[PDB]
Design an enzyme around this catalytic site. Structure first.
Site, PDB file in Angstrom:
ATOM      1  N   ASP A   1      40.646  27.551  38.922  1.00 28.05           N
ATOM      2  CA  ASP A   1      39.705  28.700  38.744  1.00 28.05           C
ATOM      3  C   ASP A   1      40.350  29.841  38.353  1.00 28.05           C
ATOM      4  O   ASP A   1      39.955  31.079  38.266  1.00 28.05           O
ATOM      5  CB  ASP A   1      38.969  28.936  40.020  1.00 28.05           C
ATOM      6  CG  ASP A   1      39.904  29.227  41.111  1.00 28.05           C
ATOM      7  OD1 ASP A   1      41.130  29.671  41.180  1.00 28.05           O
ATOM      8  OD2 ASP A   1      39.427  28.909  42.324  1.00 28.05           O
TER       9      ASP A   1
ATOM     10  N   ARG B   1      40.501  35.403  36.901  1.00 26.88           N
ATOM     11  CA  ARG B   1      39.978  34.466  37.765  1.00 26.88           C
ATOM     12  C   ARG B   1      38.529  34.463  37.807  1.00 26.88           C
ATOM     13  O   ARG B   1      37.752  35.368  37.435  1.00 26.88           O
ATOM     14  CB  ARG B   1      40.291  35.199  39.393  1.00 26.88           C
ATOM     15  CG  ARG B   1      39.517  34.673  40.480  1.00 26.88           C
ATOM     16  CD  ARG B   1      40.002  33.160  40.617  1.00 26.88           C
ATOM     17  NE  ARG B   1      39.606  32.856  42.079  1.00 26.88           N
ATOM     18  CZ  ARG B   1      38.659  32.357  42.418  1.00 26.88           C
ATOM     19  NH1 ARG B   1      37.497  32.194  41.636  1.00 26.88           N
ATOM     20  NH2 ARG B   1      38.444  31.946  43.745  1.00 26.88           N
TER      21      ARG B   1
ATOM     22  N   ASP C   1      34.763  28.959  43.978  1.00 22.20           N
ATOM     23  CA  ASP C   1      36.036  28.605  44.581  1.00 22.20           C
ATOM     24  C   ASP C   1      36.410  27.186  44.411  1.00 22.20           C
ATOM     25  O   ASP C   1      35.391  26.160  44.464  1.00 22.20           O
ATOM     26  CB  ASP C   1      35.804  28.694  45.986  1.00 22.20           C
ATOM     27  CG  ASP C   1      37.217  28.916  46.759  1.00 22.20           C
ATOM     28  OD1 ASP C   1      38.333  29.375  45.932  1.00 22.20           O
ATOM     29  OD2 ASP C   1      37.095  28.440  47.826  1.00 22.20           O
ATOM     30  N   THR C   2      37.655  26.660  43.923  1.00 24.20           N
ATOM     31  CA  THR C   2      38.075  25.344  43.784  1.00 24.20           C
ATOM     32  C   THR C   2      39.056  25.025  44.762  1.00 24.20           C
ATOM     33  O   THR C   2      39.558  25.940  45.467  1.00 24.20           O
ATOM     34  CB  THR C   2      38.708  25.265  42.186  1.00 24.20           C
ATOM     35  OG1 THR C   2      39.855  26.130  42.291  1.00 24.20           O
ATOM     36  CG2 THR C   2      37.719  25.110  41.350  1.00 24.20           C
TER      37      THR C   2
ATOM     38  N   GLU D   1      42.431  24.038  46.486  1.00 27.94           N
ATOM     39  CA  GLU D   1      43.749  24.322  45.877  1.00 27.94           C
ATOM     40  C   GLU D   1      44.573  23.095  45.532  1.00 27.94           C
ATOM     41  O   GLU D   1      43.842  21.902  45.954  1.00 27.94           O
ATOM     42  CB  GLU D   1      44.963  24.781  47.185  1.00 27.94           C
ATOM     43  CG  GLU D   1      44.227  26.115  47.954  1.00 27.94           C
ATOM     44  CD  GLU D   1      44.050  27.029  46.694  1.00 27.94           C
ATOM     45  OE1 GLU D   1      42.978  27.924  46.779  1.00 27.94           O
ATOM     46  OE2 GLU D   1      44.868  27.506  45.720  1.00 27.94           O
TER      47      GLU D   1
ATOM     48  N   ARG E   1      43.887  40.595  38.633  1.00 28.87           N
ATOM     49  CA  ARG E   1      43.321  39.419  37.724  1.00 28.87           C
ATOM     50  C   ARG E   1      41.913  39.918  37.175  1.00 28.87           C
ATOM     51  O   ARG E   1      41.435  40.629  37.994  1.00 28.87           O
ATOM     52  CB  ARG E   1      43.263  37.935  38.614  1.00 28.87           C
ATOM     53  CG  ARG E   1      44.429  37.509  39.241  1.00 28.87           C
ATOM     54  CD  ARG E   1      44.364  36.329  40.312  1.00 28.87           C
ATOM     55  NE  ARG E   1      43.035  36.587  41.255  1.00 28.87           N
ATOM     56  CZ  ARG E   1      42.857  35.765  42.053  1.00 28.87           C
ATOM     57  NH1 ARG E   1      43.477  34.484  41.928  1.00 28.87           N
ATOM     58  NH2 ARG E   1      41.874  36.102  42.907  1.00 28.87           N
TER      59      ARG E   1
HETATM   60  C1  LIG Z   1      36.618  35.679  42.950  1.00 29.03           C
HETATM   61  C2  LIG Z   1      37.096  36.793  43.434  1.00 29.03           C
HETATM   62  C3  LIG Z   1      38.062  36.967  44.431  1.00 29.03           C
HETATM   63  N1  LIG Z   1      38.596  38.048  44.860  1.00 29.03           N
HETATM   64  C4  LIG Z   1      39.694  38.118  45.715  1.00 29.03           C
HETATM   65  C5  LIG Z   1      39.146  37.657  47.326  1.00 29.03           C
HETATM   66  C6  LIG Z   1      40.218  37.012  47.828  1.00 29.03           C
HETATM   67  O1  LIG Z   1      41.059  37.875  48.528  1.00 29.03           O
HETATM   68  P1  LIG Z   1      42.423  37.112  49.425  1.00 29.03           P
HETATM   69  O2  LIG Z   1      43.432  36.888  48.617  1.00 29.03           O
HETATM   70  O3  LIG Z   1      42.774  38.277  50.196  1.00 29.03           O
HETATM   71  O4  LIG Z   1      41.725  35.712  50.293  1.00 29.03           O
HETATM   72  C7  LIG Z   1      40.982  36.276  46.933  1.00 29.03           C
HETATM   73  C8  LIG Z   1      40.525  34.858  46.397  1.00 29.03           C
HETATM   74  O5  LIG Z   1      40.897  34.133  45.167  1.00 29.03           O
HETATM   75  P2  LIG Z   1      41.361  32.810  45.263  1.00 29.03           P
HETATM   76  O6  LIG Z   1      40.503  31.793  45.598  1.00 29.03           O
HETATM   77  O7  LIG Z   1      42.270  32.758  43.904  1.00 29.03           O
HETATM   78  O8  LIG Z   1      42.822  32.638  46.264  1.00 29.03           O
HETATM   79  O9  LIG Z   1      40.655  36.879  45.664  1.00 29.03           O
HETATM   80  C9  LIG Z   1      37.932  39.233  44.730  1.00 29.03           C
HETATM   81  O10 LIG Z   1      38.260  40.247  45.067  1.00 29.03           O
HETATM   82  N2  LIG Z   1      36.966  39.254  43.759  1.00 29.03           N
HETATM   83  C10 LIG Z   1      36.611  38.200  43.099  1.00 29.03           C
HETATM   84  O11 LIG Z   1      35.405  38.205  42.547  1.00 29.03           O
HETATM   85 CA   LIG Z   2      40.790  29.099  44.751  1.00 28.86          CA
END
Ligand SMILES: Cc1cn([C@H]2C[C@H](OP(=O)(O)O)[C@@H](COP(=O)(O)O)O2)c(=O)[nH]c1=O
Ligand SMILES: [Ca+2]
EC number: 3.1.31.1
Length: 130
Positions: A16, A30, A35-36, A38, A76
């Site tokens: 993702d 991102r 959510d994919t 890992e 991102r």
């Molecule tokens: C998709 C998305 C993720 N995020 C943040 C939330 C999550 O915070 P945390 O890192 O604190 O868990 C993290 C999950 O992304 P990833 O699934 O790439 O790990 O990315 C956002 O803030 N906004 C978004 O739209």
């Molecule tokens: Ca992910």
């Protein structure tokens, strides 16, 4: 109404996220609303491969920002990503290789489109829903 903007692939990363050149600058994007798994989780390698194929094979990549925040806390880019007009976010959900997730108010224009795709992937018991 949202707008598609140009970008070019720099490098596939994983299920993702992807590295794209956007307004002439390298960025990690991102995917909104998904959510994919890992890499080490069931379907994680398949999701990465799916996204990879789709972005690598595209003649034209576009990014579409939603109404709210355009970068996350990690720097991102947050976007809907398109490959030759087909949304990569949706296409993965439709194949049961991503779940709808991370739906925050005001960056959720495509939420209903993606939940419909997920309903169909689940009806079909595809992949994650198998
Ligand atoms: C998709 C998305 C993720 N995020 C943040 C939330 C999550 O915070 P945390 O890192 O604190 O868990 C993290 C999950 O992304 P990833 O699934 O790439 O790990 O990315 C956002 O803030 N906004 C978004 O739209
Ligand atoms: Ca992910």
């Amino acid at each position: 109404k949202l707008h598609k903007e140009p970008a070019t692939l720099i490098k596939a990363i994983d299920g993702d996220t992807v590295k794209l050149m956007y307004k002439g600058q390298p960025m990690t994007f991102r995917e909104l609303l998904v959510d994919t798994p890992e890499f080490n989780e069931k379907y994680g390698p398949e999701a990465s491969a799916f996204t990879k194929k789709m972005v690598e094979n595209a003649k034209k990549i576009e990014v579409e920002f939603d109404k709210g925040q355009r970068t996350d806390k990690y720097g991102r880019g947050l976007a809907y990503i398109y490959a030759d007009g087909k949304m990569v976010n949706e296409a993965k959900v439709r194949q049961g290789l991503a779940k709808v997730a991370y739906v925050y108010k005001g960056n959720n224009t495509h939420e209903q489109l993606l939940r419909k795709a997920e309903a169909q992937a689940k009806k079909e018991k595809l992949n994650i829903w198998s």
